[PDB]
């Protein structure tokens, strides 16, 4: 007389019975674009002024809009999809449907071209490894 409500799971998924094979007609990766998006934003946030997911549009599983504001206040809006990161605007929450702007593979090969300061910031974190091995390694 009831059904399964919306509870919380302290596990990956409720799977007590196992045996049958799952792979069949639908092979969904279960990859959430928002998931990957918020992961990207956090990791590269240090190399820009402010970066955040676009809350003025939409984001549903396959597609998520992100915004990035570099150190020189330059803003890029990114349509994150399975095709990678596709710039859809150069302003905050700016997405144009006629922009045939090229999409890149990762955020690295994208933002490295979007802000030279990002590259320099990478160099700073890179030289940290250099001096790390200089101090600890030969002593």
How would you sum up this structure, described in words?
By secondary structure, this protein is of the alpha+beta class. The chain has a single domain, classed as Hypothetical protein (hspc210) (copper amine oxidase-like fold, 2-Layer Sandwich), CATH 3.30.2280.10. It has 3 helices and 6 strands, in the order αββββββαα. The chain has helices at 33-44, 108-114, 116-135; strands spanning 50-53, 59-60, 63-69, 75-81, 84-89, 103-104. Strands 1, 2, 3, 4, 5 and 6 form a 6-stranded antiparallel β-sheet that branches. Helix 2 (108-114) packs across helix 3 (116-135). The termini are far apart.
CATH class: Alpha Beta
Residues in β-strands, percent:
15-25%
Q: What is the total tally of β strands?
A: 6
The radius of gyration is 20 Å
The main sheet comes to: 6 strands, antiparallel
CATH architecture: 2-Layer Sandwich
Instruction: Write down the overall geometry.
Output: extended
* Number of H/I helices: 3
How would you spell out the order of helices and strands?
A: HEEEEEEHH
PDB class: structural genomics, unknown function
Keywords: HR969, human protein, nesg, structural genomics, Hs.4104 homo sapiens, NESG cluster ID 18152., PSI, Protein Structure Initiative, Northeast Structural Genomics Consortium, unknown function
Assembly: monomeric
Entry title: NMR Structure of the human C14orf129 gene product, HSPC210. Northeast Structural Genomics target HR969.
